[PDB]
Amino acid sequence: GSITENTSWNKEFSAEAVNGVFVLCKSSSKSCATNDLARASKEYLPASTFKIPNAIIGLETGVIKNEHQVFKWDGKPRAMKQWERDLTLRGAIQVSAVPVFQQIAREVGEVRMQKYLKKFSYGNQNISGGIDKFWLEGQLRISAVNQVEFLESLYLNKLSASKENQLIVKEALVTEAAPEYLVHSKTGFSGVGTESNPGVAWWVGWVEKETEVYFFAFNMDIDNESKLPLRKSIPTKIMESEGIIG
Amino acid sequence: SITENTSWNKEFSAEAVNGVFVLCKSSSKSCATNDLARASKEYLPASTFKIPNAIIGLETGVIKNEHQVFKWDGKPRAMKQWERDLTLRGAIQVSAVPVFQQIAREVGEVRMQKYLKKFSYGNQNISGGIDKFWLEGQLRISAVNQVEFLESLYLNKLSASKENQLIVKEALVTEAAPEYLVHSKTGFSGVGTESNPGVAWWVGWVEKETEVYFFAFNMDIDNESKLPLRKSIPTKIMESEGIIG
Ligand SMILES: *C(=O)N1C[C@H](NOS(=O)(=O)O)CC[C@H]1C(N)=O
Ligand SMILES: *C(=O)N1C[C@H](NOS(=O)(=O)O)CC[C@H]1C(N)=O
Ligand SMILES: [Co+2]
Ligand SMILES: [Co+2]
Ligand SMILES: [Co+2]
Ligand SMILES: [Co+2]
């Protein structure tokens, strides 16, 4: 239950000219560290990181039938070629297939979505802006601190959802496996916004490493899609320098 | 049905290996293999037994839960990598025999036998010692039966809770890529003799796109320098089929 500033991590930000924040917490000690306490508490559009709660809610409400649900490509055109295919839950999460999750949100509906975001203490819990886009271009905002809190509850199966559904979503979030560690993670990208009002990019997740568990959340301002790989490379370098991965 | 594909034998002959690969797309109703007879021949499971043993441990409550830590008592263990506290995935991935020996002891013979019958797990023969039957006893399982067992696990159709099946499934993840997850487990009984060799295993499944592939590899082994072939031969076969890599 603590947080401390460590401004030395700022070196990885300054080298790439990035304005952003990294939050890293050790589960055993309940201790977090961040480069920027102020930005750690600033709230941004979750963008595709919202697929985590949306998946849990989808399963809870029965909108997603089960773990082996296939989301069929009806076949019409879409915004990315990688979305123009049948997808599993992991596939739809991993490729961040927006129309899949828009449909899930519509079927859940506003009253149930609101209820679950309250139960999950998910950001400002403001779902105004259209049920199928509040997380991408609406009023919903969440901080890096809140993302770590949320992911810890998921890891511990302490969200207000079945253990089974929490487990389903956890496996779908596995992005790297090594003999000494598993990484569960999710990216997000709201867009380039304006040069005055940039978009946000995220990488959030946790690392199960020996007997320790490290929860993390990264975000940064972004106004050019060329910068998007920094959302993984900055926190990856940090975690490598801490000995957690790599 | 099981259908022979003798073209796969290339990857075996090249390394002078006597073994079998069984690969099934979608389900175990139809599998392909290099060797029809060896596909159904039964061998000691060795560390592949950690999969049922983990499920049974959770079902019985011996493993309290998903976040169970298996504490090291500080006494010598046969590998240094085992001389530390371990999570369930840790104990599976480093193949920490003593952790699983203790699980087995606590499960006990009666419950062990009950669950191996429920799982249709090989010859279901657990005799000769509760903490070593899968290591040096009479238990035997084929590559075909490993595929069936893993398919049941994937489908949550084993006689165990969905939760416990999901726990063990995640603990088996060994490779993650954007297009696929591999769940798998290795095993190695030992070298025995040139006349009576040990057995090496790699078993698992690949979740790819909207397809699933179940697999099981075993080979005779009498020299530990050959052990990496247990992964490389089936990996090469699956790479040529476009399933991984
Ligand atoms: C989520 O952020 N989105 C869906 C999809 N993938 O983005 S990610 O790779 O950054 O996770 C396309 C971009 C984005 C969106 N909704 O605009
Ligand atoms: C399982 O077969 N064993 C335990 C440990 N790891 O096994 S693996 O690498 O073959 O998966 C060492 C080898 C073997 C054993 N019992 O000695
Ligand atoms: Co409901
Ligand atoms: Co995990
Ligand atoms: Co043979
Ligand atoms: Co899986």
Write out the DSSP string of B145-194: HHHHHHHHHHTT-SSS-HHHHHHHHHHTEEEEETTEEEEEEEEE---B-S
Please give the distance, rounded to the nearest whole angstrom, from the Cα atom of residue B183 to the centre of ligand 6. 7
- Helix, strand, or coil (residue A55): helix
- Helix, strand, or coil (residue A154): helix
Is residue A159 within 8 A of residue B161, CB to CB? The reply is no
Degrees to nearest 5, angle at CA A10 with A5 and A12: 140
What one-character DSSP code corresponds to residue A1?
-
CA dihedral of B112, B116, B121, B127, whole degrees rounded to 10: 50
Q: Which of A55, A38, A39 is nearest to A92 (CA)?
A: A55
Q: How far apart are CA B91 and CA B98, in angstroms?
A: 9
- In Å, how far is A82's CA from the nearest CA of chain B? 11
- Helix, strand, or coil (residue B69): strand
Q: How far apart are CA A93 and CA A173, in angstroms?
A: 8
Which experimental method was this entry solved with? X-ray
> Does B69 contact A208 at a Cβ distance shorter than 8 Å?
no
Lookup: tokens for A53: 């709660």
CB distance A98 to ligand 1 below 6 Å? yes
Lookup: tokens for A146: 């809140």
Is residue A133 within 8 A of residue A82, CB to CB? The reply is no
Contacts of A65 (CB under 8 A, 6+ apart): none
Block residue for tokens 């499934």: B169
Q: How far apart are CA B100 and CA B50, in angstroms?
A: 7
Q: Which contiguous run of DSSP H or E holds residue A2?
A: strand A2-5
> Does A177 contact B178 at a Cβ distance shorter than 8 Å?
no
Pairing relationship of beta strands B69-70 and B173-177 according to DSSP bridges: unpaired
Q: Which contiguous run of DSSP H or E holds residue A214?
A: strand A212-222
**Phi, psi dihedrals of residue A37, rounded to the nearest 5°:** -60, -40
Residues of B with CB under 8 A from a CB of A: 66-67, 69, 84-87, 89-90, 93-94, 155-156, 162-163, 166-167, 169-170, 173-176, 178, 181, 207, 209-210
Which of B94, B175, B209 is facing A91, going by the closest CB pair? Answer: B209
What one-character DSSP code corresponds to residue A193?
B
Q: How far apart are CA B136 and CA B114, in angstroms?
A: 20
Is residue A216 within 8 A of residue A207, CB to CB? The reply is yes
Which one-letter amino acid corresponds to residue B131?
A: D
Q: CA neighbours within 13 Å on the CB side: how many for A134?
A: 22
Contacts of A112 (CB under 8 A, 6+ apart): A57, A61
Degrees to nearest 5, angle at CA A12 with A11 and A14: 65
Is residue B193 within 8 A of residue B180, CB to CB? The reply is no
- The fold of A1-246 is Beta-lactamase (3.40.710)
Q: How far apart are CA A210 and CA A82, in angstroms?
A: 35
- E strands of A10-157, at which residues? 20-26, 31-34, 43-44, 70-71, 87-88, 142-143
Asked if CATH classification 3.40.710.10 holds for the domain at B1-245, the reply, yes or no, is yes
The number of helix segments (H) and strand segments (E) in chain A equals: 9, 11
- Resolution of the experimental structure, in angstroms: 1.7
Write out the DSSP string of A6-47: -GGGHHHHHTTT--EEEEEEETTTTEEEES-HHHHH-EE--G
Contacts of B10 (CB under 8 A, 6+ apart): none
What one-character DSSP code corresponds to residue A165?
H
For chain A, the maximum distance between any two Cα atoms, rounded to a whole number of angstroms, is 50
Mutate to test the pocket of ligand 1, among A80, A93, A98 (most ligand atoms within 8 A of CB): A98
B144 burial (CB, 10 Å; 0-12 / 13-18 / 19+) is buried
Radius of gyration of chain A (CA): 17
Q: How far, in Å, are B120, B122, B184, B186, B233 from residue B44 at the CA level?
A: 15, 9, 17, 13, 20
Block residue for tokens 């949550």: B156
CB distance A188 to ligand 1 below 6 Å? yes
What angle in degrees, to the nearest 10, is found between the helix axes of A144-155 and A163-172? 120
Mutate to test the pocket of ligand 2, among B43, B83, B86, B97 (most ligand atoms within 8 A of CB): B97
Is residue A203 within 8 A of residue A231, CB to CB? The reply is yes
Q: CA neighbours within 13 Å on the CB side: how many for B113?
A: 9
A71 burial (CB, 10 Å; 0-12 / 13-18 / 19+) is buried
Interface probe for B, chosen from A59, A83, A171 (most Cβ of B below 10 Å), is A171
Can you name the residues that pair with B217 across neighbouring β-strands?
B21, B202
- In Å, how far is B42's CA from the nearest CA of chain A? 28
A108 burial (CB, 10 Å; 0-12 / 13-18 / 19+) is buried
Lookup: tokens for A144: 């890096």
- Helix, strand, or coil (residue A208): strand
Q: Which of B177, B173, B211, B209 is nearest to A97 (CA)?
A: B209
Q: Is A241 a catalytic residue?
A: no
